[PDB]
């Protein structure tokens, strides 16, 4: 019965070096002096905080202490600085140290995933995502930089800074701007606030399309130009394929330069057919017909994926610095 967080001090970890710029504070890599397990520390500074402990971190803790899954990043414990009241010091969130993220391995140009690499990766990403949606949680930042991958071949969702609950009984309003523009679905680009968990399925659809292209499918800087690029591939939104597209605030405002036809299977034919089937069902403009997380696990491209009989990828062991 030692699940008491906040008491253990940070000196029990030997900091090796910074690994990135976090939301609240810098993120450090360290090894545990008691178990030798490499970890990562998310610093949460309190001194000179207008409202004290950041409320954004309070939300992440409330959620992480409810998400126990192989594919969801797990928070081991929370350690503090050296104390001794009337002293200043920060808190540190402890996570298991993943070796790589997705956005890096594809930019690295040194990696390339076969069809069995992608099947097992998407498999873990969808199973962990179905576990979150069933718990009535919405991740709102799914992207390449938020998909961590260790050298074992195990995929994990990364950070839930923008996660929230979801009332499945009765629809209630939520926050609009949430996801990075490259992975944001159309309904968010048109100003929907009563959106469903379908906003993640879209962002995951770009992850699948990015594994076969090594480059984001949609790359724009403004929401209007983003809707232009999406329509050029998925087709233009209109009531024929989306009965409620007329109800969106920016519908008539953000009209594509043309009325495009869906040529998705045309530009992505080098992809296997089963993967193209799942890609098509994940990039359907109408969220009411967009497949749920469970329906992707039932597709032909992932139904028979056995994770135990999977070979580890050709992942580099030489992390590019340190």
């Amino acid at each position: 019965t030692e699940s008491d967080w906040g008491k253990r001090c940070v000196d029990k970890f030997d900091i090796i070096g910074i690994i990135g710029e976090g939301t609240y504070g810098q993120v450090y890599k360290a090894k545990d002096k008691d178990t030798g397990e490499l970890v990562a520390l998310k610093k949460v500074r309190l001194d000179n905080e207008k409202e004290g402990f950041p409320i954004t971190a309070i939300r992440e803790i409330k959620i992480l202490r409810q998400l126990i899954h192989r594919s969801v990043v797990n928070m081991k414990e929370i350690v503090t600085d050296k104390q001794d009241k009337k002293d200043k010091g920060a808190f540190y969130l402890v996570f298991e140290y993943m070796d790589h993220d997705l956005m890096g391995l594809l930019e690295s140009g040194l990696v390339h995933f076969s069809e069995d690499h992608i099947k097992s990766f998407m498999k873990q990403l969808m199973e962990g995502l179905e576990y979150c949606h069933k718990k009535n949680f919405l991740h709102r930042d799914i992207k390449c930089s938020n998909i961590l991958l260790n050298n074992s071949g195990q995929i994990k969702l990364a950070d839930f800074g923008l996660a929230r609950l979801y009332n499945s009984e009765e629809s209630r309003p939520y926050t609009n701007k949430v996801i990075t523009l490259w992975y944001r679905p159309p309904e968010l680009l048109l100003g929907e606030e009563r959106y469903t968990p379908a906003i993640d399925v879209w962002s995951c659809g770009c992850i699948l399309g990015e594994l076969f292209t090594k480059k984001p499918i949609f790359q724009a800087n403004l929401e209007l130009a983003q809707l232009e690029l999406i329509s050029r591939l998925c087709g233009s939104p209109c009531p024929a394929v989306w009965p409620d597209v007329i109800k969106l605030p920016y519908f008539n405002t953000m009209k594509p330069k043309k009325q495009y036809r869906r040529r998705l299977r045309e530009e992505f034919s080098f992809i296997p057919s089963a993967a193209l089937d799942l890609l098509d069902h994940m990039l359907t403009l109408d969220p009411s017909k967009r497949c749920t997380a469970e329906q992707t696990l039932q597709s032909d491209f992932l139904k028979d994926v056995e994770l135990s009989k999977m070979a580890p990828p050709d992942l580099p062991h030489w992390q590019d610095c340190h």
């Binding site: 019965t1 699940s3 906040g6 309190l46 004290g52 402990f53 202490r65 409810q66 126990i68 009241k85």
Partner: protein, 246 residues
């Protein structure tokens, strides 16, 4: 995985305040003044029932690990209400919690905050988060009082009177250490059993088993009537000495 946030009746007699010499009667008074301080300061600020109870639960849990002789209660009560506001998505500025605290405490009581009251509450947020082990999510008996009473079919006026009187009993149970003793589900069931006796209502006559006397066994599981009698006795003790009106 999850910490245990419940104590025996013997565990509640050896609190850190009991060890440092404070008597049980005075500690019982320190918890009432603290709970009702959080309640009033939150009411004047427009906070609702799920936020006030969460802060009061942090207050009762805090003094399970620390003594009143080391931490002023009104200071901790303000820090608990300040945290619960951010935990329950209804945050109130630290400046507003102080401006409301001085309008409710006299010079002696507000003297607990010192020269810089805001700075004395910000620092206590560090130890409060460590004392509760970053276990922010808390359920309360109010939500269960509603759901349990909603499945009751019968006299509309009688059922409604049963709920509102039990609602006050839950407002009072926060003044005791019941939250430190039983799950909120058992507290919501207990206040209904107590309200049913004072109102002379046959609660089983409004369920699916009118012949089954233990009407509650369809809401919670494995709770003998003796446990309910214990919660009722502790709640009625607040009403002793004319401390409140029924």
């Amino acid at each position: 995985t999850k910490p245990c946030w419940y104590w025996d009746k013997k565990d509640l007699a050896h609190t850190p305040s009991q060890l440092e010499g404070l008597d049980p009667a005075t500690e019982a008074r320190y918890r009432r003044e603290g709970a009702r301080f959080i309640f009033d300061v939150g009411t004047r600020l427009g906070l609702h029932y799920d936020t006030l109870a969460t802060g009061i639960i942090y207050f009762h849990r805090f003094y399970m690990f620390h003594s009143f002789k080391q931490f002023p209660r009104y200071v901790t009560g303000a820090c608990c209400l300040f945290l619960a506001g951010k935990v329950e998505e209804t945050p109130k500025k630290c400046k507003d919690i102080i401006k409301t605290a001085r309008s409710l405490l006299n010079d002696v009581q507000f003297g607990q905050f010192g020269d810089d009251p805001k700075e004395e509450v910000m620092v206590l947020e560090r130890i409060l988060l460590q004392t509760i082990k970053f276990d922010l999510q808390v359920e309360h008996p109010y939500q269960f009082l509603l759901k349990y009473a909603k499945q009751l079919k019968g006299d509309k006026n009688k059922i409604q009177k049963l709920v509102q009187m039990a609602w006050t009993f839950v407002n009072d149970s926060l003044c005791t250490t019941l939250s430190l003793q039983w799950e909120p589900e058992i507290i919501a069931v207990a206040v209904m059993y107590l309200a049913g006796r004072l109102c002379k209502f046959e609660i089983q006559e409004w369920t699916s088993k009118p012949m089954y006397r233990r009407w509650w066994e369809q809401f919670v599981q494995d709770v003998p009537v003796d446990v309910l009698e214990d919660i009722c006795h502790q709640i009625l003790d607040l009403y002793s000495q004319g401390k409140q009106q029924m």
